[PDB]
């Protein structure tokens, strides 16, 4: 650790694939011309080891290196899970 | 050319003192052309502003293209007024230091003498007509031959030595005295139509 990466929060949508979850980070921007707070979403694909998290967990992830055919972050910590 | 007539037919249509009562009036105020013995209608407010501009153009003979740039830089103060400080900056010309102080007689004596290079200033020969003369700048009249008597023929009939620039005789030294106003230098009238002509030009 002589140089930091970028860590992102978010929750989980779907993880039907092996060793792989799907993380949605989420924020609000402005319209460039008008002014209200539009919201939007992305779908990352982060690598997991051994089926840790499930559907609906807030989890956080880190930028890693190119790990597969574009699934590129590593899971850190199941934070808050419900059923 | 910078002059395209007798300066009599052209200055008839205007008929103004030109400018600070340097008087040449013999038979100016009757009408030019061959509409002259007959009458004419009223004047639009565009025409009055046009005659104001053409008045301040046949006075000096200079250009449009430098009047704009000299007009812009009077907002360098930024706590004060523009066209008044423009009227200040309009007379720090090397031609204006000749005329409004008492270095020689007339503005065309200034400009003809500074059109070929027959003056010196500050240490070497110069030729630039529109030099931004500043405070403490001894302007000479080619001191290598300034003791020809026509120079001292010109110095004696003084235009005026106000508190904006002082004058000395023995060396022809002119130095900016104090920060003037409108009431002293060109008392006091003609400004209004020029700045109106250059607002939406």
């Amino acid at each position: 650790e002589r140089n930091q990466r970028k860590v992102y929060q978010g929750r989980v949508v779907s993880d039907k694939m092996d060793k792989t979850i799907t993380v949605v980070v989420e924020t609000k921007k402005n319209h460039p011309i008008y002014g209200k707070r539009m919201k939007y979403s992305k779908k990352y694909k982060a690598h997991d080891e051994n089926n840790t998290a499930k559907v609906g967990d807030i989890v956080k992830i880190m930028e890693t290196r190119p790990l597969s055919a574009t699934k590129r972050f590593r899971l850190l910590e199941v934070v808050e899970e419900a059923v | 050319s910078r002059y395209t007539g007798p300066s009599w037919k052209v200055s008839r249509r205007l008929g103004i003192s030109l400018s600070g009562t340097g008087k040449e009036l013999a038979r100016r105020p009757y009408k030019p052309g061959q509409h002259g013995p007959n009458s004419r209608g009223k004047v639009s407010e565009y025409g009055m502003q046009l005659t104001e501009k053409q008045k301040l153009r046949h006075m000096y003979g200079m250009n449009e293209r430098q009047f704009r740039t000299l007009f812009i830089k009077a907002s360098k103060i930024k706590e004060g007024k523009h066209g008044v400080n423009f009227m200040v900056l309009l007379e720090q010309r090397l031609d204006n230091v000749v005329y409004r102080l008492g270095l020689a007689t007339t503005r065309r004596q200034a400009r003809q003498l500074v059109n070929h290079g027959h003056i010196t200033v500050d240490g070497k020969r110069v030729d630039i007509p529109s030099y931004h003369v500043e405070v403490g700048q001894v302007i000479g009249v080619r001191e290598k031959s300034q003791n020809i008597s026509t120079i001292k023929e010109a110095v004696e009939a003084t235009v005026g030595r106000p508190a904006f620039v002082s004058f000395d005789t023995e060396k022809l030294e002119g130095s900016f005295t104090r920060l003037p106003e409108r009431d002293e230098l060109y008392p006091e009238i003609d400004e209004a139509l020029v700045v109106e002509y250059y607002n939406q030009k």
Partner: protein
């Protein structure tokens, strides 16, 4: 309107026309392409020349010529003045400008700018019509 109705509508604009659409060559070589070519003037060859009558309230015989250009499009044109240096089957160079009382024409030719020559007596307005100044 309101705000998020202007978000999901793009708030469009009011695209302008032109006035001289035969000065924008819809190309004819090699493979007969389109414009890149915003022009001040074109040339062409005349195909018939004659006269036509104007609208209300005027009453004369306005003289015209129909000229097909380089860009393979045919537009009628007007010929100015009394006495013309541009006639049947020659090069002719075009201005852009519409004559009002005539219907169905929006170009008139320049004349004095090619093979054509120009003025004879207008010593004050001699910019138009092609002829050098008599220098006395």
């Amino acid at each position: 309107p309101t705000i998020n109705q202007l978000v999901r509508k793009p708030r469009k604009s009011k695209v302008e026309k032109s006035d001289s659409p035969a000065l924008n060559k819809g190309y004819n070589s090699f493979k007969k392409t389109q414009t890149n070519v915003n022009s001040p003037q074109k040339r062409g060859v005349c195909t018939r020349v004659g006269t036509m009558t104007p609208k209300k309230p005027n009453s004369a015989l306005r003289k015209y010529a129909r000229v097909r250009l380089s860009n393979l499009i045919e537009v009628t044109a007007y010929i100015p003045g009394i006495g013309h240096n541009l006639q049947e089957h020659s090069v002719v160079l075009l201005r852009g400008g519409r004559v009002k009382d005539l219907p169905g024409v929006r170009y008139h030719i320049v004349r004095g700018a090619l093979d054509t020559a120009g003025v004879n007596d207008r010593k004050q307005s001699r910019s138009k019509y092609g002829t050098k100044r008599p220098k006395a």
